[PDB]
Amino acid sequence: STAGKVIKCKAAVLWEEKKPFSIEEVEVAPPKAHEVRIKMVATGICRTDDHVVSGTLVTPLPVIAGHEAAGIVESIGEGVTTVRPGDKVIPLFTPQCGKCRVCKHPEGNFCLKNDLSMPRGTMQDGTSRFTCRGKPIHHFLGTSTFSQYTVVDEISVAKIDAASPLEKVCLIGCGFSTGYGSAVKVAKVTQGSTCAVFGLGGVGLSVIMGCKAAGAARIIGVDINKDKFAKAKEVGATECVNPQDYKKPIQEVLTEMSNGGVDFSFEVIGRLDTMVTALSCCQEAYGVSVIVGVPPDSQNLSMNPMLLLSGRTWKGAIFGGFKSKDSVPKLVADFMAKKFALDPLITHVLPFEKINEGFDLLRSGESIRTILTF
Amino acid sequence: STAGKVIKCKAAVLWEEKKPFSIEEVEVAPPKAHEVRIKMVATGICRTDDHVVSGTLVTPLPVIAGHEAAGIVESIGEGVTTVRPGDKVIPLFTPQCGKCRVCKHPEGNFCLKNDLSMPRGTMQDGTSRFTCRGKPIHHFLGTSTFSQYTVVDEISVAKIDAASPLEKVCLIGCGFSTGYGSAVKVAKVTQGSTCAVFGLGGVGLSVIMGCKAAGAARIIGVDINKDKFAKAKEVGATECVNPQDYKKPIQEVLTEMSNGGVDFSFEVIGRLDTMVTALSCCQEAYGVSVIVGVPPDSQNLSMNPMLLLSGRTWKGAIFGGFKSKDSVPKLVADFMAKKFALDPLITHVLPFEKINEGFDLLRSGESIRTILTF
Ligand SMILES: NC(=O)c1ccc[n+]([C@@H]2O[C@H](COP(=O)([O-])OP(=O)([O-])OC[C@H]3O[C@@H](n4cnc5c(N)[nH+]cnc54)[C@H](O)[C@@H]3O)[C@@H](O)[C@H]2O)c1
Ligand SMILES: NC(=O)c1ccc[n+]([C@@H]2O[C@H](COP(=O)([O-])OP(=O)([O-])OC[C@H]3O[C@@H](n4cnc5c(N)[nH+]cnc54)[C@H](O)[C@@H]3O)[C@@H](O)[C@H]2O)c1
Ligand SMILES: OCc1c(F)c(F)c(F)c(F)c1F
Ligand SMILES: OCc1c(F)c(F)c(F)c(F)c1F
Ligand SMILES: OCc1c(F)c(F)c(F)c(F)c1F
Ligand SMILES: OCc1c(F)c(F)c(F)c(F)c1F
Ligand SMILES: [Zn+2]
Ligand SMILES: [Zn+2]
Ligand SMILES: [Zn+2]
Ligand SMILES: [Zn+2]
């Protein structure tokens, strides 16, 4: 048995920004009290993992990234009550401690134990479970799923259906849930409404899925890469527009197309300019715009607050507004019952060892989600 | 009789920015089709009228300003069905045409016939009813209440209770309804919540009234003028703070006081910096911040969109989100039924002839609302 013992395994270590991941041996300590060690089965490549590489999202290096994943519990530390060895699980990059003021609030999900706002790159106790070449290696969002084995805090893992297909449901750990919840829970898209979705990657496609599920009449996809349009239409876009095709700014185009502004817009890219454009294109008196994309570190946008004074609502969210531990098992159950589809998001599959090729696919524009198998 | 005839009467004409009003004779044309000519009884001095004088708010000059008022219908044009000669009325600076997409929307109030966004300073037909010294004089927001007589479009007037005291209920034309609605309708303040209100003038006091009516447990008033604190407490503030008293930024102070951020914040001043501060002091995952103050013309704010990504909601509104013609008569009826008080807002009552002295009281910090009586 490996329980209580250090595990040597392969992980994808990021030593430096703007460099390939290094697939090499790491030592994974056993779980301490209220920790869970997981044998990973599948992990997706989310653009936020690429943001770590590019320095868009600053987190301490060296690091084991990865946050969209599924696996099987190898062992549990003292006092763990919510999972057992052999359970299928999804790591939760947004924790749910259940005890803080946010966790107790009916509409909050950004648990105060998160490692997103001011990243330390550690476990909850301020230490790391990973060593590589004799050096400590940081965690990422308390999940670090780019490893054959990881250790997470109990508040950062959810037990899921034992019959779940892990190579699909890993997407419920980030991209699907984020986009779908941003539409259905955060924006609260209404039947018959007009939506505009900026960015047609895996998260933006999931936003479209949610807008269609909510009964939107028109769903306008916006992307500078027209190769993204066919899949966007397959999952519910009624029209797609490329800003590069127009002489006028796309907020003006979208306002014209919607006969005075859209009901709901979504920024699903991570650019300051498209955050302001997306706000502007929603109807000035009653429109709602949701920021989903992750902005470049420490940069401020500029905007005219008259856009809000007329009546617009601007908001953002992490993880689609879902309380993570409550929601993830229910989303898996709903997937099992065919309430939504994940296959449209999966364009490529690779072994974990080909992680760098998977990032190349994302960066070239060719993929939506690549799923890596351990 | 005056019906069908030009009326020569007294008005306060603003010939250029940053000068006193000129109190002099104007000619007021009779109402055309779908227009209403009103003998003014009382008008309040709102800070937004001062913004016209100061150039904070750009609108065509020369102008008869004034937008918070009540009077009695003198005559109606062909086709008017909603008011009759002798009726008490409140002019509506935000119209309610009942036909546009905003008027038809359950949550919109910023009717597309408004003259706020891109002010022309005219009647709906693009002409003016006012002349002074042989020159045409612009309207303001389709209201122009700083005159013994005005002409408004039918969509810009509401009939109110014949027994109403016009020297009080004029405040339902702007400041009371704006603040109260910003709390109860736009923010939707909840029972037991903690609110922060930036700016303790007539509008901010009305926000406090609404937060208390909604059952807030804590209402923190924020103003740099500590003379405003006593009245703020009288109408429901539980604490007041002056940013000038602190070594740290007030958003940090308010976050500390509220054990991690407030539920609802309101900017009721009109400064870019306090808009960002007010957003920041609301709880990062579930807080809501409402912009009420009118910012200086054509100036953008700068902010970090991570404030929204964590889960905050940022919105603004005109006139408390109330659909104006539906709401104003009901608010007057509610005042008549003792559901809220207006006297706490009224610090000074002056003849119309003292309009300049009233504006000086506002600018000096001394008054909340001066009511001018014709
Ligand atoms: N809020 C959250 O919880 C959360 C979760 C998951 C992802 N994210 C972020 O969401 C964003 C999208 O992630 P993803 O879907 O994996 O990324 P992605 O697959 O890279 O998709 C982004 C899309 O944006 C398109 N695009 C780039 N620039 C522009 C432009 N100027 N105008 C229009 N389209 C443009 C691009 O072609 C691509 O299809 C990233 O910033 C992620 O970091 C946020
Ligand atoms: N959205 C709307 O429909 C609407 C309606 C009515 C008024 N307004 C605007 O609302 C604002 C308030 O109007 P009002 O109550 O008549 O004005 P007011 O009576 O001048 O009150 C403003 C208050 O802000 C205080 N103040 C000024 N600077 C600061 C500062 N840096 N920090 C903290 N407090 C400060 C000031 O001392 C005063 O008590 C103005 O900008 C109006 O133009 C908007
Ligand atoms: O893709 C999800 C995601 C985010 F939305 C973030 F804001 C963030 F900081 C992060 F690390 C992350 F993984
Ligand atoms: O906070 C403790 C800690 C460190 F000090 C590191 F230098 C490091 F790489 C690490 F992973 C870690 F957890
Ligand atoms: O005080 C109400 C008020 C506003 F909130 C405005 F935004 C505006 F432009 C205006 F002219 C006005 F009178
Ligand atoms: O409304 C028409 C109108 C004008 F066309 C002006 F050029 C002007 F100065 C003015 F005050 C006015 F009211
Ligand atoms: Zn929590
Ligand atoms: Zn992600
Ligand atoms: Zn209208
Ligand atoms: Zn006003």
Domain CATH number, residue A189: 3.40.50.720
Of A294, A317, A340, at which residue does a domain stop?
A317
Whether B114 and B56 have beta carbons less than 8 Å apart is answered as: no
Asked if residue B199 and residue B139 are part of one domain, the reply reads no
CATH code of the domain covering residue A365: 3.90.180.10
Asked if residue B173 and residue B28 are part of one domain, the reply reads yes
Ligand 4 neighbours, Cβ below 6 Å, are A 121-122, 126-128, 136-138
Q: Identify which of B28, B59, B127, B128 to mutate to test ligand 6's pocket (most ligand atoms within 8 A of the CB).
A: B128
Number of domains in chain A: 2
Tokens of B144: 């122009």
Ligand 2 neighbours, Cβ below 6 Å, are B 46-48, 51, 174-175, 178, 198-204, 222-225, 228, 243, 268-271, 274, 292-294, 318-319
**Residues of chain A with C-beta less than 8 angstroms from the C-beta of B302:** 300-302
Distance between CA atoms of residues A337 and A346, nearest Å = 19
Of A301, A317, A333, at which residue does a domain stop?
A317
Asked if residue B212 and residue B114 are part of one domain, the reply reads no
**Closest CA to ligand 5's atom 7:** B294
Asked if residue B341 and residue B298 are part of one domain, the reply reads no
In the numeric block, the tokens 């969210």 are attached to A317
CA–CA–CA angle B6, B7, B13 (5° rounding): 115
First to last CA, chain B: 20
Distance between CA atoms of residues B321 and A255, nearest Å = 22
Q: Centre a 10 Å sphere on the Cβ of residue A174 and count the other Cβ atoms it contains.
A: 33
Instruction: For residue A90, give the DSSP letter.
Output: E
Asked if residue B307 and residue B215 are part of one domain, the reply reads yes
A274: left (phi over 0), alpha (psi -120 to 50) or beta: alpha
Asked if residue A273 and residue A365 are part of one domain, the reply reads no
Cβ contact, residue pair A305, B260, below 8 Å: no
Of B293, B317, B341, at which residue does a domain stop?
B317
Cβ contact, residue pair A308, B291, below 8 Å: yes
Asked if residue A193 and residue A111 are part of one domain, the reply reads no
Of residues A102, A317, A304, A108, the one with CA closest to residue B306: A317
Q: How many CB pairs under 8 A join A and B?
A: 129
Asked if residue A130 and residue A74 are part of one domain, the reply reads yes
Q: Which atom of ligand 1 is nearest to the CA of A94?
A: 3
**Residues of chain B with C-beta less than 8 angstroms from the C-beta of A101:** 259-260, 283
**Residues of chain A with C-beta less than 8 angstroms from the C-beta of B315:** 308, 311-314
- Give the strands of the sheet with B288-291, arranged side by side: A239-241, A218-222, A194-198, A264-267, A288-291, A313-316, B313-316, B288-291, B264-267, B194-198, B218-222, B239-241
- Integer-rounded Cα radius of gyration of chain A: 20
Asked if residue B274 and residue B168 are part of one domain, the reply reads no
Asked if residue B342 and residue B243 are part of one domain, the reply reads no
Q: Which atom of ligand 6 is nearest to the CA of B62?
A: 11
Q: Which experimental method was this entry solved with?
A: X-ray
Chain Cα centroid distance, residue A257: 30
Cβ contact, residue pair B295, A305, below 8 Å: yes
Q: Report CA(A2)–ligand 4 centroid distance (Å).
A: 24
Task: Please tell me whether residue A358 adopts helix, strand or coil conformation.
Answer: helix
Asked if residue A217 and residue A78 are part of one domain, the reply reads no
Q: Report CA(A50)–ligand 3 centroid distance (Å).
A: 11
Residues at Cβ < 5 Å from ligand 9 ion: B 97, 100, 103, 111
Asked if residue A192 and residue A147 are part of one domain, the reply reads no
What residues make up the domain containing B267?
179-317
